[PDB]
Every structure is written in C-alpha cells, then in structure tokens.
C-alpha cells in the first residue's frame, strides 16, 4: 500500500505536468511535457492519454486520479510495459541504446542538471558490457 514517501514522489511527478499548479493536468500541459520528452503527440493522442486517467470524465486529471493510476501501476511489479515505455522516453533516436546525451536530456527535463562526469557515472552504473551505452536488457536490470 502507498506510504507517506510514495505519495511524495508521486506529487513530484504530478507537479512536473501541472506547471501552473492549479491542481489539474490539461491536455495542453501534457503536450508540453511530452514534447520535452522527445514525443510529438497529436491532440487526439493527448486526449486519449488524459482519458485513461480521467476517471470522472471532466477532461482533466486531478491529483486523486493521478495517485490512483500511479499507485495501481506500481503494484504491478510483474509488468514490463512501463519499463519499455520509460526506455523509449530515454531512447529518442530509437536505435535501442540510451546514449549519455539521451540520458542527460531526460534528467535535464526532470530539472536535474548533471555534469558530464555525473552523466558518464549514471551510464556506467547500468552499462554492464561497458560499450558506453545502456541497451534495454541493461535498462531493465537497472530498474528492477
């Protein structure tokens, strides 16, 4: 079950999308973050993404709705789809390898400014075969 800290991490995530801190995530705000993650969703795509979470159908996602969804996916430790999705967020050029630049880009988006050494260290931490990049197998092990 959700702990005090868990809700804290989920609030951090929610705030990343709720830029104006009005308590709700709009398709406009989701689009802004998706484009910052290397995606380019159409309005129809964004509407579908909001819909899956917008339990009461008012067209936006509030914290309770966000928490419900995030808590549910976290309980599915057997699911790998979320890890595959995260991998794609990192792997912007779709070549199956997360490069140092690709990893830095995501971290920068999260508001974490890392030095080149920190980035190389983050890569190294998951880079089992030492080729300088993180493939999917390496990414999973890192996440699990």
């Amino acid at each position: 079950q959700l702990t005090e800290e868990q809700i804290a991490e989920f609030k951090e995530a929610f705030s990343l999308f709720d830029k104006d801190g009005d308590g709700t995530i709009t398709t406009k705000e989701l689009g802004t973050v998706m484009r910052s993650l290397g995606q380019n969703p159409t309005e129809a795509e964004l509407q579908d993404m909001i819909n899956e979470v917008d339990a009461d159908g008012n067209g936006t996602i509030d914290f309770p709705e966000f928490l419900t969804m995030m808590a549910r996916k976290m309980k599915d430790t057997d699911s790998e789809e979320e890890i595959r999705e995260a991998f794609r967020v990192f792997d912007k050029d779709g070549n199956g390898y997360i490069s140092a630049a690709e990893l830095r880009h995501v971290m920068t988006n999260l508001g974490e400014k890392l030095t080149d050494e920190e980035v190389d260290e983050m890569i190294r931490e998951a880079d089992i075969d030492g080729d300088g990049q993180v493939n999917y197998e390496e990414f999973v092990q890192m996440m699990t």
Partner: peptide, 18 residues
Amino acid sequence: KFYATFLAAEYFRKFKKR
C-alpha cells in the same frame, strides 16, 4: 507517459543513493 516519467526520476534517485 506519466508513469514513465516517474520511473525516469526513479533511475535518478537510485543513482543518488549508494
């Protein structure tokens, strides 16, 4: 991609750890 973004932050936290 809501949860994916959370996981990205997870990759970071774990790093900041040990």
